[PDB]
Amino acid sequence: AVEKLLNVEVPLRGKYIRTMFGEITRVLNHLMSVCSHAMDVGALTPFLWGFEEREKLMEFYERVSGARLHAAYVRPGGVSQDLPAGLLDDIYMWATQFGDRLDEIEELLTDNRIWKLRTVNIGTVTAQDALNLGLSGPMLRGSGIPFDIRKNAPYDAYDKVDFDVPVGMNGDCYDRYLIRMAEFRQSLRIIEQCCNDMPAGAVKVEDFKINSPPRNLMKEDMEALIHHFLLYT
Amino acid sequence: ARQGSFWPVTFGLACCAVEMMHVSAPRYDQDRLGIIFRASPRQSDIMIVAGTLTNKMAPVLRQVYDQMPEPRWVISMGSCANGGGYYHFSYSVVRGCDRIVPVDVYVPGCPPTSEALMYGVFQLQRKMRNTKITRMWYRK
Amino acid sequence: PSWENIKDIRLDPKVHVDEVYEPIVNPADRYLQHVSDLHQYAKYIMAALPKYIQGFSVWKDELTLHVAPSAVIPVTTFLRDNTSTQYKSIIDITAVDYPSRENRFEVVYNFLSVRHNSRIRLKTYATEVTPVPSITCLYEGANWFEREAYDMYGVFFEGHPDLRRIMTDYGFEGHPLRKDFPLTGYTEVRWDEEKRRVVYEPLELTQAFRNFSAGSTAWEPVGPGRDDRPDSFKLPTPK
Amino acid sequence: GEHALRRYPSGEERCIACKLCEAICPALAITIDAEERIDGSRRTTKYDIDMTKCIYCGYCQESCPVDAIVETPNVEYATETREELLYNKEKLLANGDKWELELQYALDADAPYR
Amino acid sequence: KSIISYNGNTIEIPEEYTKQAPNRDSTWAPAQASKTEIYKNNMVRFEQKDLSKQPMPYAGIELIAQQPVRFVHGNTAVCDGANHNGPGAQGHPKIFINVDAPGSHACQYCGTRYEKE
Amino acid sequence: MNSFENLAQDVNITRSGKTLIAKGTGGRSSRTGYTATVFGANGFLGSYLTAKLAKHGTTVVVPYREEMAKRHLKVTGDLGVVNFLEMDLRNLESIDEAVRHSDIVVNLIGREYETKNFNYYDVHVEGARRIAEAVKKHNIARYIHVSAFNAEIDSPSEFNHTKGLGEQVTKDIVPWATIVRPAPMFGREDKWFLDRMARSPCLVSANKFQETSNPVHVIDVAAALERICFDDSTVAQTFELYGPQKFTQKQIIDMVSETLRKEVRHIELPKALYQAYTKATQAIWWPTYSPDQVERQFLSQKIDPSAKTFNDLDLTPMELPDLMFKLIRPYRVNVSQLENKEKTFVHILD
Amino acid sequence: AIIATAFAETVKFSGSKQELQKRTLALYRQFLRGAPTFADLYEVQFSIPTIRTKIRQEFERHRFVDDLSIQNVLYAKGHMEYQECINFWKQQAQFLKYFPEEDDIQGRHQPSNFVDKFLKNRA
Amino acid sequence: LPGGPVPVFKKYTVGSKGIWEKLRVLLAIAPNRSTGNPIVPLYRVPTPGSRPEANVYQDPSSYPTNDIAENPYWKRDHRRAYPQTAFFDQKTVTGLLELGSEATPRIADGEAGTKALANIANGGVSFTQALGKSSKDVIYGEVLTVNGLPPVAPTLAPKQWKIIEGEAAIYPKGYPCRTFH
Amino acid sequence: SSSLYRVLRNAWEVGPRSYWKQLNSIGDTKSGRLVGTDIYGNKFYETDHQDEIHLRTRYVEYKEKDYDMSQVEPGWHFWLGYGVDTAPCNTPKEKLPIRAYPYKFQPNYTGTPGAFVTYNTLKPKISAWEPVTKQR
Amino acid sequence: VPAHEIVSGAPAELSRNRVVRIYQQAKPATQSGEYGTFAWRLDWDIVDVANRWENDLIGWQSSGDYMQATQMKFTSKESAIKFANKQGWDFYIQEPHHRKFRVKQYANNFVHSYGKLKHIRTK
Numbered sequence A: 001a002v003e004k005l006l007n008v009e010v011p012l013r014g015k016y017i018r019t020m021f022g023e024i025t026r027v028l029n030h031l032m033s034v035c036s037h038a039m040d041v042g043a044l045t046p047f048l049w050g051f052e053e054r055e056k057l058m059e060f061y062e063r064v065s066g067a068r069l070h071a072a073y074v075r076p077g078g079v080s081q082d083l084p085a086g087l088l089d090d091i092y093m094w095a096t097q098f099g100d101r102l103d104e105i106e107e108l109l110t111d112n113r114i115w116k117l118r119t120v121n122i123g124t125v126t127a128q129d130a131l132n133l134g135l136s137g138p139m140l141r142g143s144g145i146p147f148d149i150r151k152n153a154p155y156d157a158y159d160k161v162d163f164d165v166p167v168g169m170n171g172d173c174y175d176r177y178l179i180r181m182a183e184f185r186q187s188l189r190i191i192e193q194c195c196n197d198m199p200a201g202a203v204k205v206e207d208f209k210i211n212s213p214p215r216n217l218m219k220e221d222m223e224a225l226i227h228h229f230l231l232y233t
Numbered sequence B: 001a002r003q004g005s006f007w008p009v010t011f012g013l014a015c016c017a018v019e020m021m022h023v024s025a026p027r028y029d030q031d032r033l034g035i036i037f038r039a040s041p042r043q044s045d046i047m048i049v050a051g052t053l054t055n056k057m058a059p060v061l062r063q064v065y066d067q068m069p070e071p072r073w074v075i076s077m078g079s080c081a082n083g084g085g086y087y088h089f090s091y092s093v094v095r096g097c098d099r100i101v102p103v104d105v106y107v108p109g110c111p112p113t114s115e116a117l118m119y120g121v122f123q124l125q126r127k128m129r130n131t132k133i134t135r136m137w138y139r140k
Numbered sequence C: 001p002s003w004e005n006i007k008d009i010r011l012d013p014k015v016h017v018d019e020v021y022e023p024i025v026n027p028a029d030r031y032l033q034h035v036s037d038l039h040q041y042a043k044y045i046m047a048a049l050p051k052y053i054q055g056f057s058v059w060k061d062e063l064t065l066h067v068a069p070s071a072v073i074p075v076t077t078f079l080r081d082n083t084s085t086q087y088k089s090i091i092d093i094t095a096v097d098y099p100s101r102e103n104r105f106e107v108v109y110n111f112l113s114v115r116h117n118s119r120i121r122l123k124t125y126a127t128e129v130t131p132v133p134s135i136t137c138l139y140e141g142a143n144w145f146e147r148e149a150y151d152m153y154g155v156f157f158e159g160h161p162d163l164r165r166i167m168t169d170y171g172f173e174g175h176p177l178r179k180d181f182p183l184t185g186y187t188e189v190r191w192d193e194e195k196r197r198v199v200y201e202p203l204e205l206t207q208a209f210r211n212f213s214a215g216s217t218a219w220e221p222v223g224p225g226r227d228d229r230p231d232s233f234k235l236p237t238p239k
Numbered sequence D: 001g002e003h004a005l006r007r008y009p010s011g012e013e014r015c016i017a018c019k020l021c022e023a024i025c026p027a028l029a030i031t032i033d034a035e036e037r038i039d040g041s042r043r044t045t046k047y048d049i050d051m052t053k054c055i056y057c058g059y060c061q062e063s064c065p066v067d068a069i070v071e072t073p074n075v076e077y078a079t080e081t082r083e084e085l086l087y088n089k090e091k092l093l094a095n096g097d098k099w100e101l102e103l104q105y106a107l108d109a110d111a112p113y114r
Numbered sequence E: 001k002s003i004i005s006y007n008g009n010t011i012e013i014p015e016e017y018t019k020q021a022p023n024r025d026s027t028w029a030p031a032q033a034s035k036t037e038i039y040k041n042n043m044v045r046f047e048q049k050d051l052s053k054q055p056m057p058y059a060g061i062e063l064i065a066q067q068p069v070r071f072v073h074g075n076t077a078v079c080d081g082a083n084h085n086g087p088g089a090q091g092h093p094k095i096f097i098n099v100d101a102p103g104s105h106a107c108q109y110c111g112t113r114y115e116k117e
Numbered sequence F: 001m002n003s004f005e006n007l008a009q010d011v012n013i014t015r016s017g018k019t020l021i022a023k024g025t026g027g028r029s030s031r032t033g034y035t036a037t038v039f040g041a042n043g044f045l046g047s048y049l050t051a052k053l054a055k056h057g058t059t060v061v062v063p064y065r066e067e068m069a070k071r072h073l074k075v076t077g078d079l080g081v082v083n084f085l086e087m088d089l090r091n092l093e094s095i096d097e098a099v100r101h102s103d104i105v106v107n108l109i110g111r112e113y114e115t116k117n118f119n120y121y122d123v124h125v126e127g128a129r130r131i132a133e134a135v136k137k138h139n140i141a142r143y144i145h146v147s148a149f150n151a152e153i154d155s156p157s158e159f160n161h162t163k164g165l166g167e168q169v170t171k172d173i174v175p176w177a178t179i180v181r182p183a184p185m186f187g188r189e190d191k192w193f194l195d196r197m198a199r200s201p202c203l204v205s206a207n208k209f210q211e212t213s214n215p216v217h218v219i220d221v222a223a224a225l226e227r228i229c230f231d232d233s234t235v236a237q238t239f240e241l242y243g244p245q246k247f248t249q250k251q252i253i254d255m256v257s258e259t260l261r262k263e264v265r266h267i268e269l270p271k272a273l274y275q276a277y278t279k280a281t282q283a284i285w286w287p288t289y290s291p292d293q294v295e296r297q298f299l300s301q302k303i304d305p306s307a308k309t310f311n312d313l314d315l316t317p318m319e320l321p322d323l324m325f326k327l328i329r330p331y332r333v334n335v336s337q338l339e340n341k342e343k344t345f346v347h348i349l350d
Numbered sequence G: 001a002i003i004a005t006a007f008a009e010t011v012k013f014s015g016s017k018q019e020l021q022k023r024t025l026a027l028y029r030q031f032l033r034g035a036p037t038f039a040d041l042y043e044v045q046f047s048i049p050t051i052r053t054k055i056r057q058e059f060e061r062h063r064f065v066d067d068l069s070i071q072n073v074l075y076a077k078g079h080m081e082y083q084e085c086i087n088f089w090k091q092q093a094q095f096l097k098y099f100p101e102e103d104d105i106q107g108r109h110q111p112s113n114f115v116d117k118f119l120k121n122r123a
Numbered sequence H: 001l002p003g004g005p006v007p008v009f010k011k012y013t014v015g016s017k018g019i020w021e022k023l024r025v026l027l028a029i030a031p032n033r034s035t036g037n038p039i040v041p042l043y044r045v046p047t048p049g050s051r052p053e054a055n056v057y058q059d060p061s062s063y064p065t066n067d068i069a070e071n072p073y074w075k076r077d078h079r080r081a082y083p084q085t086a087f088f089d090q091k092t093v094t095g096l097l098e099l100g101s102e103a104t105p106r107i108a109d110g111e112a113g114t115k116a117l118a119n120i121a122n123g124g125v126s127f128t129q130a131l132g133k134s135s136k137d138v139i140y141g142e143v144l145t146v147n148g149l150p151p152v153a154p155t156l157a158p159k160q161w162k163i164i165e166g167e168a169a170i171y172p173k174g175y176p177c178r179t180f181h
Numbered sequence I: 001s002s003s004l005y006r007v008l009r010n011a012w013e014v015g016p017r018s019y020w021k022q023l024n025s026i027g028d029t030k031s032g033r034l035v036g037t038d039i040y041g042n043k044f045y046e047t048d049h050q051d052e053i054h055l056r057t058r059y060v061e062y063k064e065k066d067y068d069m070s071q072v073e074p075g076w077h078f079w080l081g082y083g084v085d086t087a088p089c090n091t092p093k094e095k096l097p098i099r100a101y102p103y104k105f106q107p108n109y110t111g112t113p114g115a116f117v118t119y120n121t122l123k124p125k126i127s128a129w130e131p132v133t134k135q136r
Numbered sequence J: 001v002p003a004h005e006i007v008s009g010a011p012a013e014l015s016r017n018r019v020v021r022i023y024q025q026a027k028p029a030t031q032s033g034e035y036g037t038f039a040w041r042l043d044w045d046i047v048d049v050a051n052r053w054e055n056d057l058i059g060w061q062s063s064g065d066y067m068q069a070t071q072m073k074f075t076s077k078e079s080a081i082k083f084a085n086k087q088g089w090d091f092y093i094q095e096p097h098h099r100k101f102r103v104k105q106y107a108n109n110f111v112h113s114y115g116k117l118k119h120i121r122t123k
Ligand SMILES: NC(=O)C1=CN([C@@H]2O[C@H](COP(=O)(O)OP(=O)(O)OC[C@H]3O[C@@H](n4cnc5c(N)ncnc54)[C@H](OP(=O)(O)O)[C@@H]3O)[C@@H](O)[C@H]2O)C=CC1
Pocket: F039, F040, F041, F042, F043, F044, F045, F046, F064, F065, F066, F069, F089, F107, F108, F109, F110, F111, F118, F123, F146, F147, F148, F149, F181, F182, F183, F184, F185, F186, F191
């Protein structure tokens, strides 16, 4: 929003970092939501298994931003710092096993007849009512409507990566669970493409009237010091 | 026994609760120390205030605290609970949960990491381990 | 064929770029044709409901319609039910306080059409005593949004079935998102031992709020901009 | 993690009381007072951080032109009383002295990226 | 040692804790409260407390006063306070100090004193 | 805005020559400038007194024995307002540390029974003597000492006798002290009063429940104490704080029963049998009805003809009958139109 | 759909002061009738007559407001407050905000003349 | 089919060796599944505080933005070239209908055009008389489409959906969740 | 590895006194090589047994019975969290901090008479007149 | 003038015992930029007892005045007066001062002097 009002452009590497960490964030969110949902119905074990994966991803959060949760990493202009040296390799090694991690949760849930008793035809929403109520995301895609902002109105680097969109048909809790589980896989896909296509260059917009200049300029160049002073005050 | 059977009631208000969840997750595995989280204050010894306490919520928190059987202790977790944090100057926010309940340990951070929360639990256990109970009665 | 001999990715040859090339482009340019389309579209709407559409504005991909409060129900109905518009999802309703205007509050509606993959914004106005017609009859999802708008600003919505505070504390006095409501409010709470209860008292701060906006710039920062209007929407000059 | 005020290798304080940390602080957690030191230096007479207001965002450390205010990696400083979490200048300088070596590891690893 | 309180009673404080810093007895700024005033105004919260554990950072003004003057040939010394061992930008903003006038001249940032010769 | 309802003016001079300027409007972030020590602050009356003091930001020093028991007091003040010291009556240095910085010292230390470490004389005479000596040595501006009603030196009761002895020793040591004698105090979770009557298995009287006193609300005693604390015209005066209307114990039991909707069980026993029982029960480690309380059961309240009262503090005690329902609420036990109305409703469904 | 809750009234701005007067007296009747329910929900120390007295004082405060729009808003907010109280949505703490006088005497010194206000810097 | 199963020895997880590997392969639901424990010598090594690359890192920049000799700031000052918000009330659109546009004019020169602009700018023609006066050519070219249809609510980037069926789908035939691309 | 054989092997490698010490402090049985010692007396170990999972290859044995994470000296604190590869005793001279003051390590003193007492480092902003009479 | 005081929910003391000032910011003497001088500020006069005092623990500045940091911006003096009347606020208008115009000529630095020079201009 602020970038649109500022009429500036995030550089390409920054856009890729934002897309990659957006999909890491989506995985973290869906781990929390699906495992909390399962815990509420009474399936206690997927929570533990998924929170270990969350721990692994939060290490990436902490290594780029210095915080496990409140990163303040994505900012108007790009991101606050560049990726550290060994991060793409570690994200790739996590990705090589996350698929199995998802398969085992699906082994516990997808075909379990008790899970289906708790989810099938529960919380049904029709497509027209979904639109009229202001629902979005899975709450909408479960009712059969193929809408997703990443495909309909592409932002940072989502136009440059290949992924599919899952759409339900019954508009119930079970369809929404299947949608979230498929979105896990699509996020893994996008994360791998970002690990393979990460380009060189700046990660924030290269105008020091918008973002702060690098510190060695700030301590050597007069314009850089003035711009740094003004941006932080 | 008080240290080894450490049963907290969660006032899981906000993002701090996520870190509390990670204390029970496999990496740190709080129940290896004897910690079990209880829905009911009647079955709890520790209240952990983990999140922003709003004015609308303050009587609810006081009520839950009062229904805890004794002995009882309170851990304030995170800047919001400690003193208001990022929302200290808000019209709707209590500026520290120690305006509502007595607090035994304050854990800093926004959020405190899982390890920071475990460190705070260890501090409370140190306080427990140094309590005079029958020695205090003997002094009377 | 074991994990013991899995290849070390850490020593694979990485890509090495010499110079990075990122051409200089104004981000607004990509919108130009779309801007034209929105202009054309808005013209149609204003030509079709001249009883109602006070005006419209177009910024890069966002189209706003400006109407009087009494126009809200018909225009909204049109936007929901006309075949070329089909704005079936209500996205948000909020208010903006403009204390300089005779009508303080502008009420903003955002709508989405999944059919056409399009968004639109609609504005009206209100004061602390003149209500707006509720659009719950047209969108059930509007319900809570109007409640929030009442809670934060004090705008009333005529025809709302159940209009009460949704955010603030029970018995909260004031509408906190008004420009004259102070940041920390008027009252704070504590536990009172004499009374054994949570009590409300006049606000007292151990450290007063420090407002640093006194350091705003003494020089006009951006200037006028440029106009992106298409040539088919500018009045001609004689000769 | 927990904040500290650093020195030059000579032992002189690095903070020159520019107040950029105080201006940027999203939580208004920093309170600063300064005047001219009896040797003529521009230095703080008061530097306070309310750790119960702080959100641990690191903006102060980004803003500082001389690497004076920093966040250490220490998270283990829970206290039994809230009064212990109002850090004055003595406490913060002692933290800098205590944690300087770990601070130097962190700086040697991340300074090129700032 | 003995500080008379507003009550009119005596507060005893060991001599070493009355020193503003371990390396300096007196204050170095007009607005700076002395240790004696701090105890006189805050003694309630110091009762049953161990002073030897309280933070006692060294005063930087004496430490910088201990550093030898750097002598320079021309009219202008340059200072940046850099760390030649680490990477990145670890000093202060690079400034230029005029040394034409008699005596030594202090870096505004780090206090290092330069002199023409 | 808040106010300093306890202060007459904004600038104050203590009798010891300290200048106190009140800052702020009077709320939690305000400070009166006064410093007070409250001995026995964790008890029934002390907690109310500490709440009232800390409310306006006077610095309160609380000497305590057991840590967990004082924790609630911390909630009553802003940061830095309530300050805790470890204290014991056999450690003279700790008493000195407790009173050293104060403008006001109030002593509420008393016990309704004897212990293996403190008999009545040790707690009411020797402890009062030591606190008073610390006060006099440090020349404290105001010293308020609390005794009981019926405090008399040659009394049949050891409680009353040691309380009279403590009054005399206090007056001998610090001539400007203010002595306060409250009547029996009722209130939320009171001691040996309403709360006992609402949940006892059986109240056993050796005097038919005939003793009379003028029961007084604890809130009013604390409010009176705060007023005595801040007006220096109560120096060297005696106060008899007692309730408006006189009651018999049987009457109070009757009101408790009527408000409770439950009948309280009363048994009358011979004084010898009951004294033997209370002496036997003193062997357990938790507090239990004293032989000396049985002795006091035969004493009716006797108000000094020449002593300052609530009137001199411009205060009007509340009435026990009006307060009892509120004070005892948690222990309360709990047609023709209803049937006709019930007929229209649904009671069973699919 | 999204249905209204107990004692919810759709917002309608009365076009006439008499048609508002009818609604207003009906709201006053509702408050007076709910007084005993209030005393039971909120476990109050004071009596039912005290509650009804307080209700009268509240309605009295706006007895001379003239502008129709302002009366409409005062009515709609008064109905919101009735719905909040009767549904037990309020806790005791917020309900007792309405009864400041019911709490005990806050202290010996509430100034009334100039000199007393001046001695407390409140002149 | 890309994304399909890969063997366990291509996943950076510890796993088993020797006789125990044979036992695990005999007893696993899915033998290609990893255990989830990262390989200690390979993962997050060297530690982020001892990366050699830190001592060669430089601030990254792109051409021509980093040029020392051909980029005035005002040629790339995109913030100050922000698009103005265009406001149209009904008087302006009236003028567009009557006088035509800068692109396609329907105005006379001299005092005639300025006076026409003025008298629409004062209120002489209302929007509705403007619309009634408007000819078929104007109404079809400049209010409706050239075919007389209304314009549809416009889209910035149109999205054509395709449905993936068969083996490339995420779920098999039975499940009530389809794959849209 | 949760296996019994790991525990037996480590106890054999480590010896019975060390076995009982570890069982009475950390509760597991670790065997690894000593890396260095704290200024406080804490000892630090690194193991390369392949049965130890990621983040378990470094550990500390504390010098005192009332152990506390704040007793770990800075530098070692970073190493124990896998911040740096090389341990403080192995760090070259160029990458150490120069101090002109004596270095002292102090742990968390909370809940203890040594807990930090905060205060205002400024004297009050307005100074009052010292009253002096003069004779008319 | 509608009495919106009684519908806002603000404390009564605000429209009873507080005074506001309506003004334009003066051109700062330290800078030549005038960007902040066109708006009409509305802000509250300070209250003596409640404005600011020193905290006895750490030295922060406490306050009892909830309006101390609030400043409203208006596009005209008339809009500000209208708003203040609609809130029942007693106000004072401080009329702005502007620089009187005079003609400045560079050539005036070199005008020939027919008698004794009154001063040596130096440049
Ligand atoms: N309640 C009533 O009806 C009447 C009470 N009084 C007197 O009022 C004063 C307080 O009343 P109340 O609150 O009801 O009594 P409480 O028992 O509730 O509190 C008494 C206080 O004195 C302390 N105390 C008792 N013995 C000692 C001791 N050896 N050393 C240190 N402290 C001791 C207690 O500390 P700790 O908790 O550590 O034991 C406690 O804090 C007493 O002096 C009492 O005699 C007189 C007339 C009426």
